[PDB]
Write a protein that binds this ligand. Structure first.
Ligand SMILES: *[C@@H]1O[C@H](CO)[C@@H](O)[C@H](O)[C@H]1NC(C)=O
Ligand SMILES: *[C@@H]1O[C@H](CO)[C@@H](O)[C@H](O)[C@H]1NC(C)=O
Lengths: 49, 48
């Protein structure tokens, strides 16, 4: 998922933009991935109960 | 041959030279023009 950034492939957006330019896009990716992981773990806890 | 010509058409008819099958070194672009605005959006001049 692109998550509102340049593209979903970190290896490409890192070699395409300068670190400051990618920074913003990298943070967009960071928050998307982290929120998805949090959702997964919460649902797993409910299922385990 | 595009940045050192004589009649850069008018904005009502914007000319277009498709460039392919070559190696692009924009240092000639840098040295052929006293740049005033190089505001790029999809590409970085540092990595081009
Ligand atoms: C542009 O073309 C003119 C005419 O051939 C030439 O005198 C001039 O040196 C050229 N400029 C560059 C940057 O090549
Ligand atoms: C576009 O630019 C090239 C190079 O200067 C020229 O040969 C050609 O005639 C131009 N085309 C038009 C329609 O302006």
């Amino acid at each position: 998922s692109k998550f509102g950034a340049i593209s979903s492939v970190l290896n490409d957006i890192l070699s395409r933009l300068d670190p400051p330019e990618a920074e913003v896009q990298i943070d967009r990716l960071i928050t998307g991935r982290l929120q998805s992981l949090q959702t997964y773990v919460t649902q797993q806890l409910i299922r385990a109960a | 041959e595009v940045f050192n010509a004589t009649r850069f058409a008018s904005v009502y008819a914007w000319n277009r030279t498709r460039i392919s099958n070559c190696v692009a070194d924009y240092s000639v672009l840098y040295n052929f023009a006293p740049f005033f605005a190089f505001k790029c959006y999809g590409v970085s001049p540092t990595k081009l």
